[PDB]
TrEMBL record, chains A, B, C, D, E:
One of its GO terms (biological process) is energy derivation by oxidation of organic compounds. The gene is gldA. GO terms for cellular component: cytosol. PANTHER family: GLYCEROL DEHYDROGENASE (PTHR43616), GLYCEROL DEHYDROGENASE 1 (PTHR43616:SF5). This is Glycerol dehydrogenase. One of its GO terms (molecular function) is glycerol dehydrogenase (NAD+) activity. Its EC number is 1.1.1.6. Belongs to the iron-containing alcohol dehydrogenase family.
Length: 367, 367, 367, 367, 367
């Protein structure tokens, strides 16, 4: 079938980029709905307003309700209509950015996306996860277009808790291994075709950037300052990992992440932290060479990502819990069937237990 | 400053992709102006109409006037308005595709771009070159967005004259060397920022794909059939070279190409054929190691790209002509000043003469 | 699914091995039907009788009818019953050996197989090709067991025309590439499961033996003498290529060989000669790196195997003929669908034309 | 612009070289002002006088006042005039040698320079740092010529405290990284042109000599004996590092050293000790690969050079102090702007904090 | 003994450097004797006068007599005294530059040296070769100082006949092999000590620059234009080869060059052309590995340097002539005794004949 790659129209990254938002947004639209939660607007609203006003743009500030829900999208659409907004700016973290993307689709207007953290692969993607008002997961909204613009102010990102940058590393770490799996199996990506060479190259660059820059970047993150290593990792966590998963393909790591909602244990952990362990499990499943498993586990441990079930607070009654995770990971429609040669719940169960044993040995040897 | 990468929203490539245009275009818009010249519509209009009609889309066919001019854009805008078109599909070669992009911008509608040849790096870019009705160059139109969609039917491409695929190789060959030059000098790209790692990786993938697949692809092109090598080269000539030049940066090769309009001699040669020699000249200018110059010249010769002035029909009174080319390449605003350490017309003149001498020696040794 | 490897029970190879047949066959059975054509018995019957008689075994000599047909199998079964034979020895080339294997199955007795040439991968396999009495192909007989014993007298083999050893090299050359293709795609082998590591290792050893020993062995073959290089190649052509195709898997090369019966042109060429070109076509289809295609073509040319259509006397009206070959190679049930990612007749047609162009260029450069 | 390298006219190094001063100085001039402090003349004056007297040269011994000041230069010029001196010999450490160079310039006579320690890159350079009589920094005196002669008695050097040899290693360690930075950015050197290949080669030899010989040399230094390793390091600390910085270029390490005078904390540490940490900070700033940062930190630690702020007695209120250091390092005219792509105080501040964190981790892992 | 390196005080190289002579010379002296022959002043005197006049310097132009003789030095000293010159500028080729250096020594004034060709290793050295007025060799004048300043206008150099640049390559080619020989044997250099690491590194850089850039530079030289390759080779031929021979050491190649004055045959060839063959002979003498001899001969042949006696017009009666050359090369005081392990005329004779045989074979294989 056809090979397809999707991307946001324009990805912008640099220190102080928020100050230049007005100039970047002007060619797209003149009147912007600005969606962000109270915490994000607390530190960004003044800069936001000045940049847009100085560029001659209008801004209607709309504090975010907290959930990406159909009710919240309709509430913001009503607000935007009163100010005759012709575009949407989402600023903040994942739920805010998903809402802005979904809202812009239903209004059929450009969307600009300003992540204030680099903790997940989602901002660049043509996807919104819909939740109920209560925060329960409802559905996946496949969008027909990626965001027009993604603008990453790396000095804002460097101010976030360092754990969120490491979580982004966990999300981005899966990118190469899942895209490679899909390339080998010929699976269809979320872009709707087979993997391109471009997406594979970006996914492999993602992985190598994390290997070369991940530890250097964590040092900057913990000091809340911007160095080139942090800049490269932020790009890897956002653009490379975004295009990599969407146009490169998802596989076992993503499906194992979703399977962990079949148990309550890991609720306090971030998407990327669970994905890190899911990647180690995937490496067992594909029988990756010891050197490769070793390198991934070392990378994870060096930035504090979990490599054992216990590091995700998954403890006690492990056979029962991993059977639950394995069956859910292998449900109809889950991306684990993109693995070469097919996989069933018995193989995933085995991989989960062996990956945990392997992380336990790694941690022990490390002392 | 900020680092920026731009891309078309969705790049689609495969054999028979034209048959699936309707399904690919439907999520963007319902009523399409279809712009193509009489030759392209001669072979594609029936397939086009069936795909769009079967998807429930409307199509207003508008035979292209031949020039990307303000008059032609206004003519097509008038035609589109009568059919209440809400999007533009350009199908064919460069002038058609530039017109469709410019038209879609002035109507503020989505644009889909269907190249029927893979001969230049332009289709994916946020650029239209405006000409007079007479075909004289008028201006560069910087567009605020890349095309929403680029759809490359590789079986249509394989039907084109093989010389056009080799010309695309010439255009794409410059991509890595110009982006690397801009990365080293910190020049601003046409995306408006400094080069990203993503664009550099795509530009380097472009070059390596040409080295690994260029000769295999030419064999398929000359037989007018699709093999994976031809698929990889078409991607390299279109997506990788497009994003690579726009977000990676232009330098001496592009400026030397433009300088050759200061003389009449090479008028019968394609953009990519002149760019191939401009890349060799750039390698002299940056004093590339002999192995690297050797590899580029061998690649060029293996697909029939020129590596001497005589192969561009530039003969006789070479000192005068190359002085004219060198002065024009170094004019204010030309991308040759993106070269590390700066360059003046004396250095370009020297490089032109030495590159030609080097291609002459290469050709001789090759017998 | 399960991973399965099949093998003959005992594979014996060495100079003068025919003289030791009696001692090798005695532990299996006491009374042997000996099937061979008049030419083979002309040089081997005296040695045969002495070896079996000296070991205390009975031999009923049954001159072979020439075709592996149901009538011939019934004729030999009747002959064997009159002598109360309890085992079958086939000695000679493919049709004789297929008959002996099929006969032994229908009598349910041990079979010993003594190839006098090393020209195909068939002797060790659990397969008999059934023909009509007229020599037209009838059906594939999948046998439930591989031969009990295969005995290769390399001094007899060295006496055969050298072209037959090179043909065996052509058959064996496909082994690694087809088994690798099936390993990558997870196709089912004729052993009835997925590929084992053992079969993959044997198939890769086959290929490397041909690269290292093929030319050394041809020199011995042309002089009709036995050297260790010829011994290694005979093993590669017989045991390694036999287990490799049956337990490693068939793919495009085998299917392209079968497709050439859709045209009359190559009737004068051996199975392995057509398979050599089918392997080159497969390398195009999987877009093998230039170095790998180069190495295979060089190996073929160094032993006289064809790398162009013209070297198979396939000339004139090539588009029509290759369309016929491509459609037949892609019929339902053909092993070309074991190729990773699936293949259709358009892709095979393209590969055939490009492989021929590539062999034409290779031959030209070689002068 | 032009490429320029400067050097002292003659650089002499060996055990007992002071004994041969007379023969080395005779071809330059007959009557020498000898400037050294009371400690240096205490051990060297007798040898000095004998060597010059035996060669038929006159010597006027002038005990050094302690500061390289305009008053001290005028005092020594008056002393020299009474003895009709026609040349100047400075013997000892930096302040003495700067005075001798400045004095020789104002008298317009040859100067010979005899360092008794190898602790800084200054002796060979066409530079004198002028201070007030009080020891406060006054100005940089760019000299029009390098010293005519530099004579390094390595047995005198080996008698100095080993900490001074390690400090010289710290100064020399910056040489390659600063010259490479200036080569990449095309910055102007203190020689007044762009970097030559000669200076780059000498700077890279400096670095590799320190890697290969630094630890071997420290063992000799601590035992106060001369081995070839110590001889190579003395050359590296004096000639290679001297020509390397002056003709290769200064960058972030030098500017960060100067920035530390914006705080009082590190006053007890030598120039080369502060430059070692400034080099580590530069490596962060240029995002050097982890292996390279690792190698430099290991080299520093192996000879006792600081790799943390605390090892420079910079403790407490680190954000305030590093902001002060960063702003001063980025002042107009500072060599940090020779870094490729430009650098501002925010980037230096970040690099300082991250380099310190990195040295802290290195020290911890080392136990 | 001591290790010593000597250098000119300031080496300047770039296109148009002559135009900046005034600014470069001003800090040294105010009133300049300018010595050059009628041809050099014919193209340079106007530029010379403008640069010096614009800088406020006086110039007394003194057309050169043609020979570096005691009479010529006295003639120019008389001329200079009438204009109260306080410095000497020599501009042109070797005889002019030797005269200027010798003159400046006898006047005890600064000397600046401006080679207009890059054909020998001499300009930077503290050496003048004295001849009679008739042009017969008289003596070697060892100078106590290297020139204060060497200024190489590479655009003037590029205008010279390309054969002179290749001759400079021949001179510079010996540099590494002679310095390495002296380092291995511990011979004393003309700097008066043993070899330093700095000089060895510069000599090895010389050789590698010629290998990497020699052919690229010749192309520019033949086109009379400046490229970076030509700039690197000019530096190699002048600074690196100058300091390399003087501070690195001379050996067999230099002595064999001098030995060829024992016969009349090669009088039409340049110093560097004879030195190229002397280097090949040295490689035989030290039994260099075949790869190394091969590489040097290939380098020589690629720029037109001789690798046979016949290419130096040394033909007929070769045993007699080479005995004469060998005895002279081994005379008392000749640098051939710097070769490791000592060498006598029998060994040199053998090496000469074998080197010639080797060049003859090389030329033959090259066709
Ligand atoms: Zn994820
Ligand atoms: Zn182009
Ligand atoms: Zn076969
Ligand atoms: Zn310093
Ligand atoms: Zn010489």
């Amino acid at each position: 079938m056809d090979r397809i790659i999707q991307s946001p129209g324009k990805y912008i990254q640099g220190t102080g980029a928020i100050k230049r938002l007005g100039d970047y947004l002007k060619p797209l639209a003149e009147r912007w709905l600005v969606v962000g939660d109270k915490f994000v607007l607390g530190f960004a609203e003044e800069m936001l307003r000045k940049s847009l006003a100085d560029a001659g743009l209008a801004a209607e500030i709309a504090p975010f309700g907290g959930e990406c829900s159909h009710n919240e999208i309709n509430r913001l659409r009503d607000i935007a209509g009163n100010a005759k907004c012709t575009a949407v700016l989402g600023i903040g973290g994942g739920k805010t950015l998903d809402t802005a993307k979904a809202l812009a689709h239903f209004m059929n207007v450009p969307v600009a996306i300003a992540p204030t953290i680099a903790s997940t692969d989602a901002p660049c993607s043509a996807l919104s996860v819909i939740y109920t008002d209560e925060g329960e997961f409802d559905s996946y909204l496949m969008l027909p277009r990626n965001p027009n613009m993604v603008i990453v102010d790396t000095q804002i990102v460097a101010g976030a808790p360092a754990r969120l940058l490491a979580a982004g590393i966990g999300d981005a770490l899966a990118t190469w291994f899942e895209a490679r799996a899909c390339s080998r199996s010929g699976a269809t990506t979320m872009a709707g075709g087979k993997c391109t060479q471009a997406a594979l190259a970006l996914a492999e660059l993602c992985y190598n950037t994390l290997l070369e820059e991940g530890e250097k970047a964590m040092l900057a993150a913990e000091q809340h300052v911007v160095t080139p290593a942090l800049e490269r990792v932020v790009e890897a966590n956002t653009y490379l990992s975004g295009v990599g998963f969407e146009s490169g393909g998802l596989a076992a790591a993503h499906a194992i992440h979703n399977g962990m909602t079949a148990i309550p244990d890991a609720h306090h952990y971030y998407h990327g932290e669970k994905v890190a362990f899911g990647t180690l499990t995937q490496l067992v499943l594909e029988n990756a060479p010891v050197d490769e498993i070793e390198t991934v586990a070392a990378l994870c441990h060096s930035v504090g990502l979990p490599i054992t079930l216990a590091q995700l607070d998954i403890k006690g009654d492990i056979p029962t819990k991993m059977r639950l995770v394995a069956e859910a990971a292998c449900a109809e429609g889950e991306t684990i069937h993109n693995m070469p040669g097919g996989v069933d719940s018995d193989q995933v169960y085995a991989a989960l237990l062996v990956a945990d044993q392997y992380g336990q040995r790694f941690l022990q040897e490390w002392e």
